[PDB]
């Protein structure tokens, strides 16, 4: 066993080793190992991406115009965000400016994804860490109604309704086929909701499972389908025709009407179901405002997103602020430049890749993706891992750093950045939310805080959906229909050699695609994805990433039942396919 100190933590791999493989209710494949001391407190945390596909390799030699379609399949959960980063990156390289309506529609596609992804994460992925589903069988339907009605204007609150939901769950379990609920953690002492709140939350789980399917109809209108909508370099392929012959073959007034209907229902569901449920979980689980802080009070990163001025990616344009905080200094939000070789770098000393010098980090324009499965001195063998060796290479995930700093990304990160840059809406929303829970601002820097910020963001994005739709309609009213710029569609028009960066804020955090074009083909394509940051392994200085830090110092009631680990990891919304690509 060894011990060292990093970022205020004592990393100590003495004592009992716990393994969680597979991590469920995430996207893709992850392994987590911890060491716990005699007090059942985590003294070591190990984050391992257990998949790789190699999109950066596959993309070499392809047409830049096709890139978006390949990289979209990095992830079906954050479906679309890689396509967006891709078209941004190729446009940046070639020197393409898209028409305003294309930009607005892209912002709509991203806002739609935020709403959908955050909602499904809250209920289907994270929710059963907080709601004891089997305890809902003990609830009183009327008390459930009364609770729901005290929290929300949402119509669906009748005692008979909660009774019907409860009876559905009863009939589901009565044959001993518990399905997704089998061998869960039900009854664990960290489940703190009263039975009525469990039945309220379980009802909402089912309502959310139903409703989410509707949100992505906006993607179907503008992008053909969901999952995995279509895009183009130069704008979007969904040509608009409002008032001319053949409007039946385009985005017309009836199609826009459908979009408006979905926006309204989406905002209503988020504001009246998800938001009150998020606050209720807060209310019954306030100790988790002080668990799982990790890097969230030290180092946080946003690139920013939602450019409101078409083709302008500066501070005055991006509606979701960018910036970096290091050293817990939230009074110094620092500017981020994704071309600067000294800012974003990835290390692979603790990952399954080859670099010429594994003791230095490479900016993505100098990035290398040369897979090398080498777990070294594991307990077990290279095809039968009982214990990773975190002193060596232990993940398919590269280790990104910002100016050498280990950073947290995602909703909590963005919220902190926006808050401290003085964004009025963010400040008002956070203050209101923490006021309601009688918690300090610092309570947001926590596992509970990550979930609260995700709910805040879903509401924020639903509001932005309407804003963008209104801007699109304003253009249409003014006779401005253009959706694509094609002056530089043909390879012959491109620079012989050029490179570019496409960046946005995916649901899980800061996303960048770095692309180099040469002789009409992709020369290099390097992705650094939000979960790459958060699930990162260690660097040459032994510095730990956001997941490892957040798991550090965590109390476990029952070592064999990893509920606390699941709570903290799930709170980041891990996308492991994204992380590894």
């Amino acid at each position: 066993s060894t011990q060292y100190e990093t970022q205020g933590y004592t990393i100590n791999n003495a004592g009992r080793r716990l393994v969680v493989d597979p991590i469920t209710r995430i996207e893709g494949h992850m392994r987590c190992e911890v060491n716990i001391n005699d007090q059942n407190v985590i003294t070591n945390a190990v984050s391992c991406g257990t998949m790789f596909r190699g999109l950066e390799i596959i993309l070499q030699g392809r047409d830049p115009r096709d890139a978006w379609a390949f990289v979209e399949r990095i992830c079906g959960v954050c479906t679309g965000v890689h396509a967006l980063a891709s078209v941004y990156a190729i446009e940046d390289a070639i020197g393409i400016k898209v028409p305003d309506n294309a930009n607005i529609i892209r912002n709509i596609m991203l806002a739609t994804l935020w709403c959908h992804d955050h909602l499904v994460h809250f209920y289907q992925l994270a929710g059963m860490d907080w709601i004891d589903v089997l305890d809902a069988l003990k609830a009183d339907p009327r008390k459930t109604s009364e609770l729901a009605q005290s929290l929300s204007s949402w119509p669906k609150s009748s005692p008979g309704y909660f009774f019907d939901v409860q009876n559905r769950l009863k009939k589901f379990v009565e044959g001993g086929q518990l399905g997704i609920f089998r061998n869960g953690y039900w009854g664990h002492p960290q489940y703190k909701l009263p039975p009525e709140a469990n039945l309220m939350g379980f009802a909402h789980y089912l309502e959310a499972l139903d409703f989410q399917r509707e949100i992505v109809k906006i993607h179907a209108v503008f992008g053909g389908k969901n999952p995995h909508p279509n895009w183009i370099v130069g704008g979007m392929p969904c040509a608009i025709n409002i008032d001319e012959s053949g409007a039946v073959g385009a985005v017309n007034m009836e199609r826009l009407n459908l979009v408006q209907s979905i926006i309204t229902r989406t905002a209503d569901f988020i504001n009246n179901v998800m938001i009150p449920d998020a606050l209720a979980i807060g209310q019954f689980n306030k100790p988790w405002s002080e668990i799982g802080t990790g890097l969230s009070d030290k180092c946080v990163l946003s690139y920013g997103a939602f450019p409101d001025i078409a083709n302008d990616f500066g501070e005055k344009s991006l509606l979701m602020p960018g910036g970096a905080v290091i050293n817990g200094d939230f009074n110094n939000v620092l500017p981020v430049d994704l071309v600067d070789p000294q800012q974003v770098q990835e290390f692979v000393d603790h990952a399954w890749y080859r670099y010429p010098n594994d003791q230095v980090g490479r900016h993505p324009f100098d990035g290398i993706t040369d897979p090398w499965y080498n777990p070294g001195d594991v307990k077990g063998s290279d095809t039968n891992i009982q214990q990773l060796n975190e002193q060596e290479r232990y993940s398919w995930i590269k280790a990104p750093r910002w100016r050498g700093n280990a950073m947290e990304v995602g909703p909590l990160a963005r919220t902190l950045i926006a808050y401290h840059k003085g964004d009025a809406a963010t400040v008002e929303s956070v203050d209101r939310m923490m006021s309601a829970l009688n918690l300090p601002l610092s309570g947001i820097q926590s596992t509970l805080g990550r979930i609260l910020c995700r709910a805040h963001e879903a509401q924020w994005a639903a509001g932005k959906l309407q804003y963008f739709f209104d801007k699109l309609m304003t253009n249409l009213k003014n006779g401005n229909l253009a959706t694509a710029s094609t002056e530089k569609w043909e390879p012959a028009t491109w620079p012989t050699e050029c490179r570019g960066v496409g960046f946005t804020e995916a649901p899980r955090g800061a996303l960048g695609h770095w692309a180099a074009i040469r002789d009409g083909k992709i020369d290099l394509y390097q992705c650094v994805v939000p979960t790459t940051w958060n699930a990162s392994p260690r660097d040459p200085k032994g510095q730990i990433g956001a997941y490892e830090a957040a798991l550090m110092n965590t109390k476990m009631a029952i070592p064999e039942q990893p509920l606390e680990i699941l709570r903290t990891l799930h709170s980041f919304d891990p996308c492991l396919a994204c992380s590894t690509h």
Binding site: T50, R73, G76, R213, A220, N226, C238
Partner: protein, 263 residues
């Protein structure tokens, strides 16, 4: 009466096939799960993790040996001794084989499990391999597409439960009901194709009138799927209806048939 046990496993994937399934409009995925099947294992949705998840897996495939349907999303990589995809510290392929051995039938969801999809595109860094090249002694129903249509997925499930049998398949193992014909055999822009009325650059007058997307690279003519009839997301749209040519995403090796924007 007991619902049919389904074990849903995940190899190399993007999770687009799980996401598609939960978009189902009729039956709702909720009702599929609660009332039509017993979804007894599924990494993306299940409560249990780690050793608890391993216990569910082993219990289900033992207790219902010979009796469960195996659904596979994603595919096994053969490279690096299979450790490009690791589950419970071992190659995913070992989990696939163990699950396959006890199944009555297998559903290969999506172009991943059916053909290979994006990870199998040149130069296939991981030696990603479709399920039927690994499992050779079980009925495999291929349900391709990246992903398949939500209501196709749920329809195939309801068929199997309602009629108590597998869908009839073409020679490639795809259900005739939804993969018997080509996109281009039921495309509402065929009138334009037949008349030589084509989009030639994005957002031209032809595009604003819904003209055919052949000259923009549409691969509808060689692609078997239900997109132009059943459509996507409760009949709201499909790729071509929203102005982008078919990529060919339901067909074997579609990533390596050249640029999406070429013939």
């Amino acid at each position: 009466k007991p619902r049919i046990p389904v074990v849903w496993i995940h190899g190399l994937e993007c999770t687009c096939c799980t996401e598609s399934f939960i978009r189902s409009a009729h039956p709702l995925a909720k009702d599929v799960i609660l009332s039509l099947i017993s979804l007894d294992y599924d990494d993306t949705l299940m409560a249990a993790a780690g050793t608890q998840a391993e216990e569910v897996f082993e219990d289900i495939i033992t207790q219902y040996n010979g009796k469960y349907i195996l659904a596979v999303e994603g595919n096994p990589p053969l490279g690096e001794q299979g450790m490009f995809c690791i589950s419970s510290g071992r190659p995913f392929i070992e989990k696939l084989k163990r699950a396959a051995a006890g199944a009555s039938a297998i559903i290969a969801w999506g172009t991943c499990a059916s053909w290979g999809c994006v990870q199998a595109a040149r130069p296939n860094p991981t030696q990603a391999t479709p399920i039927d090249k690994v499992i050779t002694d079980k009925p495999i129903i291929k349900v391709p597409g990246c992903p398949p249509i939500p209501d196709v997925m749920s329809a195939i499930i309801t068929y199997m439960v309602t009629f108590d049998r597998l869908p009839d398949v073409d020679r490639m193992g795809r259900p005739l009901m939804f993969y018997g014909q080509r996109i281009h055999d039921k495309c509402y822009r065929r009138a334009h194709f037949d008349a030589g009325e084509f989009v030639q650059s994005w957002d031209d007058d032809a595009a604003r009138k819904g003209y055919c997307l052949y000259k923009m690279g549409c691969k509808g003519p060689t692609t078997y799927n239900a997109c132009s009839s059943t459509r996507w997301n409760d009949g709201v749209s499909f790729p071509i209806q929203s102005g982008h040519g078919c990529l060919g995403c339901a067909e074997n090796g579609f990533w390596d048939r050249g640029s999406f924007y070429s013939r």
